[PDB]
């Protein structure tokens, strides 16, 4: 399948509390493999996956010094946007960046990303053609003209097509088999009281990786989308994930409902029913 290398960047000013916090977090196929935090006692790039430790001391020193120069660039950027938006030097503000590439099975670039955000709202983004910019407001228009004059879109097309893909394949050689690891969900149904003649049937999916999963409740063969309750997928804390879905059913009609678990680790979708003890 396709692969991706993406970097999530955060720069937060905190006037009166110290220097801005800067973070660089890298993901291979949505999996964190490197992270830089300026608030550490020693600010250095650190591997977040054991398979990144084969990379030599020159790689870590090159990335660390690059992050530190990026941090200075963001410190300047936070001051610039105070002028763009006519904001005071006393407030805290956030700059966020998503940067990276999506690569297909043939090794060719599928999608390139360079997206910015200021205080949680879109600021500017590189368009899918990798030649034009989409600016979200008047302040972003200043950045757009500045970047158009300097050919910045030109500079990222070269990085996204060349540098990003080459690093992604280099990282993939060390961690390709690790990223494909899956853990299938273990599932069961629980039974809970409801007022009067109703009961709740809760279908659990536990200990699965990756996080993508689908849980459905069926009366006969009809999916009960409008009537069920479900929680957002959540981490167990040990690397796996959890999710549940529940429906309120009439008392005595529990055996009329079926739960279905769809996960990429399963040979075929799981089918479950409420099962009372002997």
């Amino acid at each position: 399948g396709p692969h991706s290398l993406r970097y999530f960047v955060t720069a937060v000013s905190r006037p009166g509390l110290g220097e801005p916090r800067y973070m660089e977090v890298g993901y291979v196929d949505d999996t964190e493999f490197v992270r830089f935090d300026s608030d550490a006692e020693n600010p250095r790039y650190e591997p977040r996956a054991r398979w990144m430790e084969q990379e030599g001391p020159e790689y870590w020193e090159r990335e660390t010094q690059k992050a530190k120069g990026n941090e200075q660039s963001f410190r300047v950027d936070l001051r610039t946007l105070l002028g763009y938006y006519n904001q005071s030097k006393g407030g805290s503000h956030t700059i966020q960046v998503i940067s990276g590439c999506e690569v297909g099975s043939d090794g060719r670039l599928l999608r390139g990303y360079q997206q910015y955000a200021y205080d949680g709202c879109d600021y500017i983004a590189l368009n899918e053609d990798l030649k034009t910019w989409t600016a979200a407001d008047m302040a972003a228009l200043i950045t757009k003209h500045k970047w158009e004059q300097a050919g910045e879109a030109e500079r990222l097309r070269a990085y996204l097509e060349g540098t990003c893909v080459e690093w992604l394949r280099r990282y993939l050689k060390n961690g390709n088999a690790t990223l494909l690891r899956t853990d299938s969900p273990k599932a069961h149904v629980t039974h809970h009281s409801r007022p009067e003649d109703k009961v709740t049937l809760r279908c659990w999916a536990l200990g699965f990786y990756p996080a993508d999963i689908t849980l459905t409740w069926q009366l006969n063969g009809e999916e009960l989308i409008q009537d069920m309750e479900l929680v957002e997928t959540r981490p167990a804390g040990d690397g796996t994930f959890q999710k549940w879905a529940s429906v309120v059913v009439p008392l005595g009609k529990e055996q009329y409902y079926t739960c279905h678990v769809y996960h990429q680790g399963l040979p075929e979708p799981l089918t479950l029913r409420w099962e009372p003890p002997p």
């Binding site: 960047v9 660089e24 090159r62 990026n70 940067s99 910015y116 540098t163």
Partner: peptide, 8 residues
């Protein structure tokens, strides 16, 4: 390897 960012 993350890109070197350009000023806004």
């Amino acid at each position: 390897s993350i890109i070197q960012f350009e000023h806004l």
